[PDB]
Design a protein around this ligand. Structure first.
Ligand SMILES: COc1ccc2sc(-c3cncc(NC(C)=O)c3)nc2c1
Length: 342
């Protein structure tokens, strides 16, 4: 009949209405996004006199507690980052309104998927990819602060927003599926395209799962297509193996879900389970990037900063990000000191 005196819908979301005024403060403009958490609306704040993005959580206990964990992480980050210089989206405040938790964020521009979409998935240049790579590594360095130890756990182009359309500044949004380092409670985390091997293999994991995601994300920004576009976990692992080969034996011996993907032959080596795919490590990243053939699709031939020497700096950095072992996979601090950012 009527849910929350007619304010909500069957799905517990607030029925957003153009031009509604909340608390004599926020003038609601339009719906900009929707998620399982609920909705995101564009609004004008008449006290601060600026546009804001409001995340209106569903009126239900499961999402209210989830959103509360995000609110805890953002208010903890805002405490450390006062100067607003570590590339995380700023939570201005939060309030309860008609039985909905509302989060007030700074208004940013489109996401990195939208930029890829406007190219018809042909990608952006390497100069712009470097600027996104530099800011993202700085952001992961901030999350690796020992008192934070925050894992975003769902890094992808949609969850990276541009501050301003005419600038290269980006901020990471959406810490709803994020957590601080600790004992393993969850194994089904990260979006499949961006999911680390340790998660695919069902193994212990830490903040290095974000660095794997970042490696996948940076190649997609320049090529325009997902590096590993698995339709299922078995497809995801096979496409990872296509590029990087079979994970080391000492990892697959410890992986619980190792036999979901590989067979252990009588001699001790691990082989792919028969199901198509190129043999392991033959779809070279060297050839995917087109280090010697003028970039992806030859569409970067003759462009500045797109030489073979420049592509090898990017290839090396990306390979260090896609290290199978999370203990030896490159960390934000060392990645920033790479020759690619020189
Ligand atoms: C379009 O101007 C903005 C500015 C700041 C933010 S913060 C955010 C967000 C927060 N939490 C989860 C998600 N994820 C979704 C909707 O899928 C997005 N969106 C925006 C949009």
């Amino acid at each position: 009949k009527v849910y929350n005196d007619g304010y909500d819908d069957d799905n517990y979301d607030y029925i957003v209405k153009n031009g509604e005024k909340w608390m004599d403060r926020y003038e609601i403009d339009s719906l900009i996004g929707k998620g399982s958490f609920g909705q995101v609306v564009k609004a004008y704040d008449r006290v601060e006199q600026e546009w804001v993005a409001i995340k209106i959580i569903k009126n239900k206990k499961a999402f209210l507690n989830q959103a509360q964990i995000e609110v805890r992480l953002l208010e903890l980050m805002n405490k450390h980052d006062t100067e607003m210089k570590y590339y995380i989206v700023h939570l201005k405040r939060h309030f309860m309104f008609r039985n909905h938790l509302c989060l007030v964020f700074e208004m940013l521009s489109y996401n990195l998927y939208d930029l890829l979409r406007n190219t018809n998935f042909r990608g952006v240049s390497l100069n712009l990819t470097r600027k996104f790579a530099q800011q993202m590594c700085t952001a992961l360095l901030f999350l690796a602060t020992p008192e934070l130890s925050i894992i975003h756990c769902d890094l992808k182009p949609e969850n990276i927003l541009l501050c301003n359309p005419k600038r290269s500044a980006i901020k990471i949004v959406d810490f709803g599926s994020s957590c601080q380092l600790g004992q393993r409670i969850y194994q089904y985390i990260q979006s499949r395209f961006y999911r680390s091997p340790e998660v695919l293999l069902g193994m212990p994991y830490d903040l290095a799962i974000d660095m794997w995601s970042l490696g996948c994300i940076l190649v997609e920004m320049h090529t325009g297509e997902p590096l590993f576009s698995g339709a299922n976990e078995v497809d995801q692992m096979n496409k990872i193996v296509e590029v990087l080969g079979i994970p080391p034996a000492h990892i697959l011996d410890q992986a619980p879900k190792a036999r979901k993907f590989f067979e252990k032959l009588p001699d001790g080596t691990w082989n792919l389970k028969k199901t198509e795919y190129k043999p392991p490590g033959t779809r070279k990243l060297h050839n995917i990037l087109g280090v010697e053939t003028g970039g992806p699709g030859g569409r970067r031939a003759g462009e500045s900063g797109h030489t073979v020497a420049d592509y090898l700096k990017f290839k090396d950095l990306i390979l260090r990000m896609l290290d199978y072992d999370p203990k030896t996979r490159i960390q934000p601090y060392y990645a920033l000191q790479h020759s690619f950012f020189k």
